[PDB]
Amino acid sequence: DYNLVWQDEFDDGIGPDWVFETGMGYNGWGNNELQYYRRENAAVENGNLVITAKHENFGGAQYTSARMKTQGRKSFKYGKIEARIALPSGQGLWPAFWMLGNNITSVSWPACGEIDIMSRINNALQTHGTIHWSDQNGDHASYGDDVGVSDPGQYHIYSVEWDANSIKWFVDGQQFNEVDISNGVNGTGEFQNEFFILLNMAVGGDWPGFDVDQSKLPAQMLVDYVRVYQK
Ligand SMILES: [Ca+2]
Ligand SMILES: [Cl-]
Ligand SMILES: [Mg+2]
Numbered sequence: 001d002y003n004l005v006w007q008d009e010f011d012d013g014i015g016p017d018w019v020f021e022t023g024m025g026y027n028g029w030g031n032n033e034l035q036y037y038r039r040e041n042a043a044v045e046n047g048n049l050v051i052t053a054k055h056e057n058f059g060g061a062q063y064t065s066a067r068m069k070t071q072g073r074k075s076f077k078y079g080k081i082e083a084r085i086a087l088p089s090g091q092g093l094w095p096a097f098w099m100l101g102n103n104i105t106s107v108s109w110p111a112c113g114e115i116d117i118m119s120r121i122n123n124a125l126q127t128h129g130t131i132h133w134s135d136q137n138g139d140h141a142s143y144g145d146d147v148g149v150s151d152p153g154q155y156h157i158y159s160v161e162w163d164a165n166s167i168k169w170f171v172d173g174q175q176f177n178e179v180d181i182s183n184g185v186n187g188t189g190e191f192q193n194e195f196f197i198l199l200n201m202a203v204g205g206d207w208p209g210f211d212v213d214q215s216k217l218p219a220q221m222l223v224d225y226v227r228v229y230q231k
Contacts, residue, residue: 002080002229009225010049014042017073021200024061030109033094034204034212036061042068049223051201053093055214063212067200075102075194076228081117082159083199084224087152089123090216092209094202096120097158097226099195110134113190115167116144118158121208125149129160129169129177136187145169147176155224164192199223 008015020039028034036059041052053065083097096119101112111134120127130144149156149171161168169177181188201221204210 002231004227005076005079005230006074006228007225008049009047010044010223011047013044014049014068017070018068019071019073021067021069023059028205029067029202031202031205031207032210033202034061034092034210035063035065035202037067037200038064039066040064042066047224049199051095051199051221051223053088053201053203053217053219053221055217063203063217065201065203067198067202069100069196069198071100071102071196073196075196076230077192077194078162078164078230080159080161080229081115081197081226082157082228083117083226084155084157085118086155086222086224087120088216088219088221089153090213090219091122092204092212093216093219094119094121094205094208095221096198096200096202097223098198100198101190102194102196103190107190110140111190113188113193113195115160115162115191115195117160117169118171120149120152125152127152127156127158127171131167131179131188131191133188133190141187143179145177147171147174155222162191167191197226197228199226 104112114132135141165182
């Protein structure tokens with residue numbers, strides 16, 4: 001049986017387990033992204049975390065947004081990891097709810113492993129669920145799928161169920177992807193370690209492309225809560 005082990009409900013403020021990232025990382029957070037992250041772009045309104053992407057000139061970038069992680073504060077080995085999220089739509093927008101291995105600090109990416117619980121680009125009427133890792137040959141590996149979401153601007157539940165043998169993805173309880181990780185098959189051993197959680201909204205990058213509909217800015221990603229259950 002799944003029992004609640006951690007949550008952030010965003011009742012009146014951002015909880016104690018989040019660290020905010022700033023700037024453009026290395027080569028636009030490794031994806032040629034166009035936003036400069038700032039603390040100012042994350043706030044709480046009416047029981048939701050609000051991450052706002054803005055058309056705003058700052059530090060050589062023309063967009064600002066927020067990126068938050070639980071690294072060094074909260075991490076999990078296995079569980080049902082989920083969030084209740086409403087998404088804005090617009091060419092260039094790239095929201096995500098995801099996880100990275102704690103060992104990123106020693107083995108780097110993608111060897112640390114990455115679980116993308118939800119990602120979306122532009123105005124797509126679908127969302128994605130993906131893993132990234134370093135396979136048995138030491139090569140960058142990825143495995144993903146997508147599911148139709150009629151109105152991503154409404155709230156939906158995005159989750160993964162992760163155990164020693166598999167990762168399963170769901171939107172509103174509907175499974176749309178599964179990966180076998182049992183005994184570290186296909187060099188997936190890295191998914192047997194602790195992972196921390198991230199939330200962000202990028203603007204532009206390799207995946208969504210470099211055209212941005214600035215008439216959709218400021219754009220708000222609404223996160224009602226993040227919850228983690230374990231059995
Ligand atoms: Ca809430
Ligand atoms: Cl569990
Ligand atoms: Mg709704």
